[PDB]
Design a protein around this ligand. Sequence first.
Ligand SMILES: *[C@@H]1O[C@H](CO)[C@@H](O[C@@H]2O[C@H](CO)[C@@H](O)[C@H](O)[C@H]2NC(C)=O)[C@H](O)[C@H]1NC(C)=O
Ligand code: NI
Length: 228
Amino acid sequence: HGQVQNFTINGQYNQGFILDYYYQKQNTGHFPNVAGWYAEDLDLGFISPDQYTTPDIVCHKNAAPGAISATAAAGSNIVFQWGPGVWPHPYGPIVTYVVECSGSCTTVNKNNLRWVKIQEAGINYNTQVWAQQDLINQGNKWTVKIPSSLRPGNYVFRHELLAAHGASSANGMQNYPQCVNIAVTGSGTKALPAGTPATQLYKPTDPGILFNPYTTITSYTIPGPALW
Ligand SMILES: *[C@@H]1O[C@H](CO)[C@@H](O[C@@H]2O[C@H](CO)[C@@H](O)[C@H](O)[C@H]2NC(C)=O)[C@H](O)[C@H]1NC(C)=O
Ligand code: NI
């Protein structure tokens, strides 16, 4: 359990969506305009395999686009900061996707977004240590590079932890997707390819979704489509 509360682009601070804003909205009808998506999981919980074909897998529970967008040059590093507490969950991979928006991302139909994998990290076979343990050891921070070749445009980045402590059972994998609006500028010239609807990323029986984390692992298939 946890959420992306803020993030940096080339060191520069950007405000993310925090749970306090959900309660602001309940009380007053409005909340601060931020690049992180609004979402309604009040515990900072997860989406389950039985929800892999539902709108909630796109950007988490009842999610809606942030009212503004951040911005970054292609080749920039994003550092997602998870919180408010230390990440609980030392087992599992970390993946990040990007999708382009037709028009502003602030008003996009999330269900029409098509995702391209730009980062993935699993288990180090020699240490048996997962990417999520590395996240805990890096102060809840994860670095993702925006591909240098990516052409300017309005994009959404979908950063996701797949906590695998329960993955040996059907429906046990816990997905924590978090979306942020980040427009891209600069000197990249390549269009994003066709990509994959979020509802087609994962199946409950995929080899890296349903597996035993409590035994020595010599081969692991990180879930989702191929790295771009
Ligand atoms: C960016 O988000 C992080 C992560 O939640 C915030 O860091 C937390 O800050 C609180 C309040 O000071 C501390 O009690 C926690 O220990 C921190 N958690 C972690 C994991 O670092 C940080 O405050 C946010 N930045 C801003 C400016 O709001
Ligand atoms: Ni949790």
